[PDB]
mmCIF file of C-alpha atoms and ligand atoms in Angstrom:
data_model
loop_
_atom_site.group_PDB
_atom_site.id
_atom_site.type_symbol
_atom_site.label_atom_id
_atom_site.label_comp_id
_atom_site.label_asym_id
_atom_site.label_seq_id
_atom_site.Cartn_x
_atom_site.Cartn_y
_atom_site.Cartn_z
ATOM 1 C CA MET A 1 155.665 75.601 139.854
ATOM 2 C CA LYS A 2 153.844 77.528 137.125
ATOM 3 C CA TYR A 3 155.817 79.706 134.732
ATOM 4 C CA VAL A 4 155.533 81.774 131.562
ATOM 5 C CA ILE A 5 157.810 82.116 128.530
ATOM 6 C CA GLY A 6 158.465 85.423 126.811
ATOM 7 C CA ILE A 7 160.347 85.411 123.480
ATOM 8 C CA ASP A 8 161.705 88.513 121.735
ATOM 9 C CA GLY A 9 162.321 87.426 118.152
ATOM 10 C CA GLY A 10 164.348 90.528 117.348
ATOM 11 C CA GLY A 11 166.592 91.460 114.453
ATOM 12 C CA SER A 12 169.715 91.470 116.623
ATOM 13 C CA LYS A 13 169.061 88.091 118.294
ATOM 14 C CA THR A 14 166.351 85.776 119.579
ATOM 15 C CA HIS A 15 165.985 86.382 123.324
ATOM 16 C CA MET A 16 163.905 84.241 125.706
ATOM 17 C CA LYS A 17 163.032 84.801 129.355
ATOM 18 C CA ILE A 18 161.344 82.169 131.504
ATOM 19 C CA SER A 19 159.669 83.692 134.560
ATOM 20 C CA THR A 20 157.641 82.606 137.531
ATOM 21 C CA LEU A 21 154.188 84.133 137.885
ATOM 22 C CA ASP A 22 155.684 86.543 140.470
ATOM 23 C CA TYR A 23 157.948 87.966 137.727
ATOM 24 C CA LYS A 24 161.125 86.316 139.007
ATOM 25 C CA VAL A 25 163.116 85.648 135.836
ATOM 26 C CA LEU A 26 164.587 82.162 136.273
ATOM 27 C CA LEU A 27 166.677 82.091 133.109
ATOM 28 C CA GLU A 28 167.351 83.835 129.853
ATOM 29 C CA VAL A 29 168.538 82.305 126.599
ATOM 30 C CA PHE A 30 169.964 83.853 123.437
ATOM 31 C CA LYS A 31 169.913 82.476 119.902
ATOM 32 C CA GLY A 32 170.627 83.961 116.508
ATOM 33 C CA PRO A 33 168.066 86.185 114.815
ATOM 34 C CA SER A 34 165.652 83.956 112.912
ATOM 35 C CA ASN A 35 162.510 85.230 111.186
ATOM 36 C CA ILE A 36 160.160 83.580 108.693
ATOM 37 C CA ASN A 37 160.422 86.695 106.501
ATOM 38 C CA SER A 38 164.170 86.071 106.054
ATOM 39 C CA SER A 39 164.511 82.340 106.852
ATOM 40 C CA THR A 40 162.651 79.207 105.844
ATOM 41 C CA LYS A 41 159.850 77.865 108.020
ATOM 42 C CA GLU A 42 162.088 74.885 108.809
ATOM 43 C CA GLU A 43 164.923 77.178 109.931
ATOM 44 C CA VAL A 44 162.664 79.169 112.266
ATOM 45 C CA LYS A 45 160.890 76.111 113.677
ATOM 46 C CA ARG A 46 164.221 74.520 114.596
ATOM 47 C CA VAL A 47 165.318 77.641 116.485
ATOM 48 C CA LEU A 48 161.998 77.873 118.352
ATOM 49 C CA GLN A 49 161.941 74.225 119.477
ATOM 50 C CA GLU A 50 165.634 74.335 120.395
ATOM 51 C CA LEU A 51 165.159 77.573 122.346
ATOM 52 C CA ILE A 52 162.085 76.344 124.241
ATOM 53 C CA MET A 53 163.283 72.792 124.990
ATOM 54 C CA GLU A 54 166.696 74.154 126.003
ATOM 55 C CA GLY A 55 165.296 76.534 128.608
ATOM 56 C CA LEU A 56 162.925 73.818 129.756
ATOM 57 C CA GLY A 57 165.949 71.538 130.082
ATOM 58 C CA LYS A 58 167.912 73.931 132.286
ATOM 59 C CA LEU A 59 164.711 74.697 134.210
ATOM 60 C CA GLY A 60 164.006 70.972 134.579
ATOM 61 C CA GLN A 61 160.280 71.302 133.883
ATOM 62 C CA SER A 62 157.741 70.238 131.272
ATOM 63 C CA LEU A 63 155.526 72.269 128.965
ATOM 64 C CA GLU A 64 152.593 71.219 131.178
ATOM 65 C CA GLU A 65 153.570 73.760 133.852
ATOM 66 C CA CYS A 66 153.893 76.592 131.313
ATOM 67 C CA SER A 67 150.835 78.805 131.783
ATOM 68 C CA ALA A 68 151.413 81.018 128.718
ATOM 69 C CA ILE A 69 153.880 81.721 125.912
ATOM 70 C CA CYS A 70 154.183 85.119 124.236
ATOM 71 C CA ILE A 71 156.371 85.684 121.172
ATOM 72 C CA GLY A 72 157.026 89.084 119.639
ATOM 73 C CA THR A 73 158.745 89.151 116.283
ATOM 74 C CA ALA A 74 159.009 91.329 113.218
ATOM 75 C CA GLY A 75 156.223 90.608 110.745
ATOM 76 C CA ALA A 76 154.010 88.828 113.302
ATOM 77 C CA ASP A 77 151.332 91.494 112.886
ATOM 78 C CA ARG A 78 150.029 89.523 109.883
ATOM 79 C CA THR A 79 147.677 86.681 110.819
ATOM 80 C CA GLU A 80 149.435 84.582 108.168
ATOM 81 C CA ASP A 81 152.615 84.747 110.262
ATOM 82 C CA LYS A 82 150.583 84.311 113.474
ATOM 83 C CA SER A 83 149.134 80.921 112.508
ATOM 84 C CA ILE A 84 152.473 79.632 111.207
ATOM 85 C CA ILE A 85 154.173 80.567 114.482
ATOM 86 C CA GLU A 86 151.421 79.155 116.704
ATOM 87 C CA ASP A 87 151.595 75.911 114.712
ATOM 88 C CA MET A 88 155.318 75.541 115.383
ATOM 89 C CA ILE A 89 154.666 75.863 119.111
ATOM 90 C CA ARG A 90 151.610 73.572 119.022
ATOM 91 C CA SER A 91 153.747 70.956 117.252
ATOM 92 C CA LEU A 92 155.937 70.686 120.378
ATOM 93 C CA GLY A 93 152.867 69.455 122.247
ATOM 94 C CA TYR A 94 152.119 72.742 123.991
ATOM 95 C CA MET A 95 148.459 72.917 124.938
ATOM 96 C CA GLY A 96 148.286 76.274 126.739
ATOM 97 C CA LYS A 97 147.937 79.936 125.871
ATOM 98 C CA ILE A 98 149.969 81.310 122.949
ATOM 99 C CA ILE A 99 150.167 85.029 122.145
ATOM 100 C CA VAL A 100 151.946 85.984 118.895
ATOM 101 C CA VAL A 101 152.478 89.716 118.339
ATOM 102 C CA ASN A 102 154.689 92.125 116.439
ATOM 103 C CA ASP A 103 157.949 93.072 118.145
ATOM 104 C CA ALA A 104 156.642 96.586 118.842
ATOM 105 C CA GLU A 105 153.909 95.273 121.136
ATOM 106 C CA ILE A 106 156.361 93.504 123.462
ATOM 107 C CA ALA A 107 158.678 96.528 123.402
ATOM 108 C CA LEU A 108 155.813 98.768 124.474
ATOM 109 C CA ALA A 109 154.813 96.362 127.250
ATOM 110 C CA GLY A 110 158.359 96.021 128.568
ATOM 111 C CA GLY A 111 159.164 99.690 128.125
ATOM 112 C CA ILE A 112 156.072 101.226 129.736
ATOM 113 C CA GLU A 113 154.467 98.368 131.764
ATOM 114 C CA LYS A 114 151.032 99.509 130.540
ATOM 115 C CA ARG A 115 148.791 99.062 127.496
ATOM 116 C CA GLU A 116 148.915 102.725 126.453
ATOM 117 C CA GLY A 117 151.785 104.787 125.107
ATOM 118 C CA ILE A 118 153.991 104.936 122.010
ATOM 119 C CA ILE A 119 157.058 102.876 121.101
ATOM 120 C CA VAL A 120 159.547 103.737 118.357
ATOM 121 C CA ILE A 121 161.898 100.969 117.275
ATOM 122 C CA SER A 122 165.010 101.838 115.307
ATOM 123 C CA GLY A 123 167.435 98.934 115.233
ATOM 124 C CA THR A 124 168.004 96.876 112.121
ATOM 125 C CA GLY A 125 164.474 97.893 111.084
ATOM 126 C CA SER A 126 162.103 100.617 112.215
ATOM 127 C CA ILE A 127 158.450 101.000 113.201
ATOM 128 C CA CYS A 128 156.196 103.122 115.422
ATOM 129 C CA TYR A 129 153.306 101.621 117.378
ATOM 130 C CA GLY A 130 150.991 103.170 119.913
ATOM 131 C CA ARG A 131 147.752 102.882 121.808
ATOM 132 C CA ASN A 132 145.677 105.819 123.051
ATOM 133 C CA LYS A 133 143.441 106.339 126.087
ATOM 134 C CA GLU A 134 140.545 104.852 124.086
ATOM 135 C CA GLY A 135 142.476 101.569 123.929
ATOM 136 C CA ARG A 136 142.829 101.909 120.155
ATOM 137 C CA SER A 137 146.154 101.067 118.522
ATOM 138 C CA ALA A 138 147.883 102.258 115.387
ATOM 139 C CA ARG A 139 151.189 101.711 113.652
ATOM 140 C CA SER A 140 153.244 103.569 111.084
ATOM 141 C CA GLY A 141 156.299 102.471 109.210
ATOM 142 C CA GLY A 142 157.465 98.896 109.673
ATOM 143 C CA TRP A 143 157.228 98.070 105.984
ATOM 144 C CA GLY A 144 160.569 96.265 105.747
ATOM 145 C CA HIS A 145 163.926 96.786 104.167
ATOM 146 C CA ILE A 146 162.795 97.218 100.521
ATOM 147 C CA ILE A 147 159.776 99.543 100.756
ATOM 148 C CA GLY A 148 160.209 100.869 104.289
ATOM 149 C CA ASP A 149 162.510 100.900 107.326
ATOM 150 C CA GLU A 150 163.039 104.658 107.031
ATOM 151 C CA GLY A 151 165.360 105.875 109.774
ATOM 152 C CA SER A 152 166.456 102.325 110.634
ATOM 153 C CA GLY A 153 170.021 101.145 110.933
ATOM 154 C CA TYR A 154 169.619 99.297 107.626
ATOM 155 C CA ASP A 155 168.470 102.553 106.003
ATOM 156 C CA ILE A 156 171.407 104.441 107.544
ATOM 157 C CA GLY A 157 173.843 101.819 106.241
ATOM 158 C CA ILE A 158 172.449 101.936 102.697
ATOM 159 C CA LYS A 159 172.468 105.731 102.746
ATOM 160 C CA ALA A 160 176.045 105.728 104.017
ATOM 161 C CA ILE A 161 177.178 103.522 101.145
ATOM 162 C CA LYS A 162 175.290 105.673 98.621
ATOM 163 C CA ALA A 163 176.932 108.791 100.018
ATOM 164 C CA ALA A 164 180.356 107.128 99.905
ATOM 165 C CA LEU A 165 179.806 106.163 96.275
ATOM 166 C CA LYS A 166 178.619 109.653 95.346
ATOM 167 C CA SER A 167 181.743 111.032 97.052
ATOM 168 C CA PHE A 168 183.892 108.613 95.039
ATOM 169 C CA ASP A 169 182.236 109.244 91.672
ATOM 170 C CA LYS A 170 181.830 113.038 92.188
ATOM 171 C CA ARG A 171 178.028 113.141 92.280
ATOM 172 C CA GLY A 172 178.045 114.155 95.935
ATOM 173 C CA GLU A 173 179.887 116.033 98.644
ATOM 174 C CA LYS A 174 183.179 114.536 99.746
ATOM 175 C CA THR A 175 182.823 112.408 102.873
ATOM 176 C CA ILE A 176 185.201 110.343 104.979
ATOM 177 C CA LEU A 177 182.657 107.540 104.616
ATOM 178 C CA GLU A 178 184.300 106.895 101.246
ATOM 179 C CA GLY A 179 187.299 105.260 102.916
ATOM 180 C CA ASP A 180 185.875 104.611 106.375
ATOM 181 C CA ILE A 181 183.312 102.115 105.047
ATOM 182 C CA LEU A 182 185.957 100.072 103.207
ATOM 183 C CA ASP A 183 188.193 100.091 106.290
ATOM 184 C CA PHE A 184 185.310 98.912 108.485
ATOM 185 C CA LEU A 185 184.394 96.077 106.107
ATOM 186 C CA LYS A 186 188.084 95.122 105.662
ATOM 187 C CA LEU A 187 187.771 95.793 101.925
ATOM 188 C CA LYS A 188 190.398 97.157 99.552
ATOM 189 C CA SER A 189 188.523 98.746 96.643
ATOM 190 C CA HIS A 190 185.211 100.236 95.593
ATOM 191 C CA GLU A 191 184.769 97.024 93.591
ATOM 192 C CA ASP A 192 185.252 94.805 96.646
ATOM 193 C CA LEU A 193 182.270 96.708 98.014
ATOM 194 C CA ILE A 194 180.163 95.674 94.997
ATOM 195 C CA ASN A 195 180.819 91.962 95.467
ATOM 196 C CA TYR A 196 180.227 92.371 99.207
ATOM 197 C CA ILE A 197 176.799 93.967 98.726
ATOM 198 C CA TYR A 198 175.564 91.986 95.722
ATOM 199 C CA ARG A 199 177.206 88.548 95.933
ATOM 200 C CA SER A 200 178.470 87.814 99.470
ATOM 201 C CA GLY A 201 175.144 86.967 101.119
ATOM 202 C CA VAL A 202 175.463 89.952 103.454
ATOM 203 C CA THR A 203 172.716 90.244 106.067
ATOM 204 C CA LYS A 204 170.492 93.148 107.032
ATOM 205 C CA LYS A 205 172.244 93.298 110.409
ATOM 206 C CA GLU A 206 175.631 93.623 108.703
ATOM 207 C CA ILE A 207 174.495 96.573 106.566
ATOM 208 C CA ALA A 208 172.854 98.137 109.621
ATOM 209 C CA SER A 209 176.207 97.846 111.418
ATOM 210 C CA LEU A 210 177.542 100.597 109.147
ATOM 211 C CA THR A 211 175.574 102.966 111.392
ATOM 212 C CA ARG A 212 178.625 102.654 113.686
ATOM 213 C CA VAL A 213 180.764 104.106 110.893
ATOM 214 C CA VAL A 214 178.322 106.980 110.398
ATOM 215 C CA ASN A 215 178.377 107.755 114.109
ATOM 216 C CA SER A 216 182.187 107.655 114.240
ATOM 217 C CA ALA A 217 182.478 109.897 111.180
ATOM 218 C CA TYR A 218 179.982 112.389 112.653
ATOM 219 C CA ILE A 219 182.149 112.618 115.810
ATOM 220 C CA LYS A 220 185.088 113.376 113.479
ATOM 221 C CA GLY A 221 183.096 116.285 112.041
ATOM 222 C CA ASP A 222 181.896 114.725 108.774
ATOM 223 C CA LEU A 223 178.976 116.809 107.462
ATOM 224 C CA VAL A 224 177.450 114.128 105.219
ATOM 225 C CA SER A 225 177.347 111.776 108.193
ATOM 226 C CA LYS A 226 175.694 114.346 110.453
ATOM 227 C CA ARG A 227 173.021 114.924 107.806
ATOM 228 C CA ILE A 228 172.300 111.198 107.471
ATOM 229 C CA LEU A 229 171.770 110.984 111.241
ATOM 230 C CA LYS A 230 169.541 114.071 111.304
ATOM 231 C CA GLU A 231 167.372 112.802 108.469
ATOM 232 C CA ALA A 232 167.030 109.437 110.229
ATOM 233 C CA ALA A 233 165.824 111.277 113.338
ATOM 234 C CA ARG A 234 163.346 113.141 111.124
ATOM 235 C CA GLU A 235 161.944 109.888 109.692
ATOM 236 C CA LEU A 236 161.522 108.480 113.194
ATOM 237 C CA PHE A 237 159.743 111.666 114.229
ATOM 238 C CA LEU A 238 157.425 111.380 111.222
ATOM 239 C CA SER A 239 156.494 107.882 112.351
ATOM 240 C CA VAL A 240 155.473 109.278 115.765
ATOM 241 C CA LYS A 241 153.575 112.202 114.235
ATOM 242 C CA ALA A 242 151.569 109.719 112.151
ATOM 243 C CA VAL A 243 150.581 107.527 115.105
ATOM 244 C CA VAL A 244 149.820 110.583 117.282
ATOM 245 C CA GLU A 245 147.560 112.063 114.584
ATOM 246 C CA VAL A 246 145.804 108.768 113.784
ATOM 247 C CA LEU A 247 145.073 108.161 117.466
ATOM 248 C CA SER A 248 143.882 111.762 118.078
ATOM 249 C CA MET A 249 146.687 112.423 120.557
ATOM 250 C CA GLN A 250 148.095 115.685 119.114
ATOM 251 C CA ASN A 251 146.979 117.708 122.169
ATOM 252 C CA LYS A 252 147.114 115.004 124.861
ATOM 253 C CA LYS A 253 149.668 113.677 127.308
ATOM 254 C CA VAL A 254 151.397 110.576 125.909
ATOM 255 C CA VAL A 255 154.234 108.458 127.293
ATOM 256 C CA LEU A 256 156.728 107.519 124.576
ATOM 257 C CA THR A 257 159.757 105.251 124.734
ATOM 258 C CA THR A 258 162.353 104.011 122.270
ATOM 259 C CA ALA A 259 164.004 100.682 121.449
ATOM 260 C CA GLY A 260 166.897 99.702 119.231
ATOM 261 C CA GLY A 261 170.540 100.638 118.779
ATOM 262 C CA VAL A 262 170.089 103.498 116.336
ATOM 263 C CA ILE A 263 167.762 105.614 118.451
ATOM 264 C CA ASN A 264 169.106 104.616 121.869
ATOM 265 C CA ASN A 265 172.877 104.730 121.193
ATOM 266 C CA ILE A 266 173.531 107.821 119.092
ATOM 267 C CA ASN A 267 173.450 110.996 121.187
ATOM 268 C CA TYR A 268 172.941 113.400 118.266
ATOM 269 C CA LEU A 269 170.179 111.311 116.664
ATOM 270 C CA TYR A 270 168.373 110.802 119.965
ATOM 271 C CA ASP A 271 168.688 114.527 120.754
ATOM 272 C CA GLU A 272 167.383 115.513 117.321
ATOM 273 C CA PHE A 273 164.426 113.135 117.660
ATOM 274 C CA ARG A 274 163.614 114.511 121.120
ATOM 275 C CA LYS A 275 163.899 118.108 119.835
ATOM 276 C CA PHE A 276 161.410 117.419 117.022
ATOM 277 C CA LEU A 277 159.006 115.860 119.531
ATOM 278 C CA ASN A 278 159.409 118.541 122.191
ATOM 279 C CA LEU A 279 158.666 121.307 119.690
ATOM 280 C CA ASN A 280 155.736 119.688 117.894
ATOM 281 C CA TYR A 281 154.148 117.630 120.706
ATOM 282 C CA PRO A 282 155.221 119.154 124.039
ATOM 283 C CA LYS A 283 152.824 116.900 125.983
ATOM 284 C CA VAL A 284 154.677 113.768 124.840
ATOM 285 C CA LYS A 285 156.783 112.568 127.790
ATOM 286 C CA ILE A 286 159.842 110.606 126.608
ATOM 287 C CA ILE A 287 161.143 107.897 128.958
ATOM 288 C CA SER A 288 163.645 105.077 128.880
ATOM 289 C CA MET A 289 162.365 101.521 128.684
ATOM 290 C CA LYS A 290 161.695 100.048 132.100
ATOM 291 C CA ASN A 291 162.540 96.501 130.933
ATOM 292 C CA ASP A 292 163.649 94.824 127.724
ATOM 293 C CA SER A 293 161.310 93.377 125.089
ATOM 294 C CA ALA A 294 161.711 89.784 126.301
ATOM 295 C CA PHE A 295 160.423 90.923 129.668
ATOM 296 C CA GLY A 296 157.636 92.730 127.812
ATOM 297 C CA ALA A 297 156.668 89.352 126.388
ATOM 298 C CA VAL A 298 156.705 87.929 129.928
ATOM 299 C CA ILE A 299 154.300 90.725 130.970
ATOM 300 C CA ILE A 300 151.927 90.021 128.088
ATOM 301 C CA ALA A 301 152.049 86.277 128.801
ATOM 302 C CA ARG A 302 151.661 86.550 132.592
ATOM 303 C CA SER A 303 148.956 89.218 132.409
ATOM 304 C CA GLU A 304 146.731 86.633 130.630
ATOM 305 C CA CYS A 305 147.119 84.271 133.639
ATOM 306 C CA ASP A 306 145.370 84.410 137.015
HETATM 307 O O1 BGC B 401 161.825 95.831 114.007
HETATM 308 C C1 BGC B 401 161.018 96.924 113.628
HETATM 309 C C2 BGC B 401 160.301 96.581 112.347
HETATM 310 O O2 BGC B 401 161.276 96.197 111.317
HETATM 311 C C3 BGC B 401 160.581 96.019 110.002
HETATM 312 O O3 BGC B 401 161.537 95.675 109.101
HETATM 313 C C4 BGC B 401 159.503 94.949 110.137
HETATM 314 O O4 BGC B 401 158.785 94.841 108.893
HETATM 315 C C5 BGC B 401 158.538 95.274 111.219
HETATM 316 O O5 BGC B 401 157.617 94.158 111.355
HETATM 317 C C6 BGC B 401 159.255 95.476 112.527
HETATM 318 O O6 BGC B 401 158.340 95.893 113.547
#
């Protein structure tokens, strides 16, 4: 009868799981990525109500039987975002437990199934979050696409375009990104790229998708592309080093896992990241995520219930 809702409000999509209290996932629903930092409050509210009422429609149950709802989304570390999100859910008539957290917290829960450890996210954006044996948490990075996101897919895509333009205008080393980016975007000229970036309403996810071009060019032997991937791995490592140092974990065993397409898909980048960690923090044990972030939100929600 009773159930919990876990929502991963990620940059790739919005992903909901509804689960019984025995962790049997009854259904999962996908919507478009929608975040109050990049959409209006009205746009996000509509997605949240639609998502929740939809799943409750297929499940054939009311909000009264929902024991807890956990939502993890980018930017939800700020209490300003927290209250706005809780209000949207309260406005549906939900009267139970609501837990609003940053996306890294649900990724850590789903990845490790414990409170302690470190998560690195590199998808559209990037962040590192961890919690030590003292129960104390810390984060590094996560400052968004203008003043942060180092080593993210968005950052890789911007750097790829900059390298392609420097190749074209002779400020930088020649790279096959110069033509490969235009081919990928179905564009004819270097000027079509300007209108695409500055006028077309391109999304963060679309720019981050150029990471696929960087990976393909690296496999073709492109040196500029290899260097972009290595430096992204270095930025992700720096985010771990920061959290490890802040939490006094430099000489302790730590379990670390990784989420997002950049870090988890690209063999060279993942290998470089692991090499940096193995050399500098040999007691960090790197593992794959045991479950996805939506299931992490289910764990956080259900763990607050009897
Ligand atoms: O998705 C990883 C990170 O992306 C950044 O752009 C956001 O500011 C963070 O809140 C988020 O944790």
